[PDB]
């Protein structure tokens, strides 16, 4: 049988799928993620903040 990928398939998004939140996923915390500090962030902390005495 043709073992190649099939061109001639609908390339468009499919508007026929459950649009609701899925209540069937692991609800527990995930113990599988980089636990390190992550040196990839903006070190210049000034783009937006509340300057009032009682902010």
């Amino acid at each position: 049988a043709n073992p190649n990928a099939n061109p001639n398939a609908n390339p468009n998004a499919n508007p026929n799928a459950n649009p609701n939140a899925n209540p069937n996923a692991n609800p527990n915390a995930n113990p599988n993620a980089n636990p390190n500090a992550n040196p990839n962030a903006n070190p210049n902390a000034n783009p937006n903040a509340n300057p009032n005495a009682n902010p």
Partner: antibody, heavy 120, light 112 residues
Amino acid sequence: VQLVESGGGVVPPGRSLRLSCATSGFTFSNYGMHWVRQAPGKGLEWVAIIWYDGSRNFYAASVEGRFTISRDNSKNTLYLQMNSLRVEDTAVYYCARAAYYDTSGYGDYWGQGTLVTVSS
Amino acid sequence: SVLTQPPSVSGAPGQTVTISCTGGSSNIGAGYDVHWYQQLPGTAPKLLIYGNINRPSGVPDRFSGSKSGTSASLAITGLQAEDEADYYCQSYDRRLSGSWVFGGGTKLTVLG
């Protein structure tokens, strides 16, 4: 924006050297800083970053534990204290001002650096 | 050397030359923006391109960038003799402990 650098010179291996990047034209205290280095004949290598308030210090794996990065917000000065210098640490060290765009950061200004030679 | 760059690029002045940079799924194809720096032969590098395509005002409108998958690029049009420099690409490698990673750097020689 201007970054002024000094403190290079020849230091025997095992000994320490302090670099100092004086800055002006901008509020030093509001920006993080970077050090990069380039050994003569080599490409660019990232060395360290300091967070504008000193809350984070990250180092290249090859220098962590030997190098210390610090910043004195009252003197507008960035420092790099290198202990246990090795011959392999000979390079022009440069300071640069931290900048950040979207998913990654970048430098937007460089000083001219100073040459640190580890020898004899 | 984290990002792959050719050691050399060249062309006659007036020509268009490009400097490539290729990474992996961890550093360029990872969604991290690529930046380019120009190191004139006897000085500190300067920002040439940022955000994959933009230039920092002072940079002549001869330089522009590009990004695709793990590929990144710097195009120099109207090549001048004065463009001789080492061009470097910069990104962030999610597998490493540092903040910035650099490519090997490409030396641009202008044949004139």
